[PDB]
Amino acid sequence: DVMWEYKWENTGDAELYGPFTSAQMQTWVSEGYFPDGVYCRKLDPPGGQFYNSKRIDFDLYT
C-alpha cells in the first residue's frame, strides 16, 4: 500500500495529518471532504515538496 499525508494549510506549523492508506485518502479526497484540496504528500520520507491533493493522481498508485 501507500499512505498519503494531508495538510489543510500550506504552512510549516499547520496541522499534519493523512497517515492513512491511499485508499482512505482517495475516499475523503474523492468524497468531497476537500472542496479546495489539501497539502497531500507521501508519509515516507517525512518532510518534502508537498503537493495539493487536487494535483496528485492516486489512481496511478492503487
Partner: peptide, 11 residues
C-alpha cells in the same frame, strides 16, 4: 463503505 471524519476539521 462508510468512513469516519478526517483529522484537523474545524468546528
Amino acid at each position: 463503505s462508510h468512513r469516519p471524519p478526517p483529522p484537523g476539521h474545524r468546528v
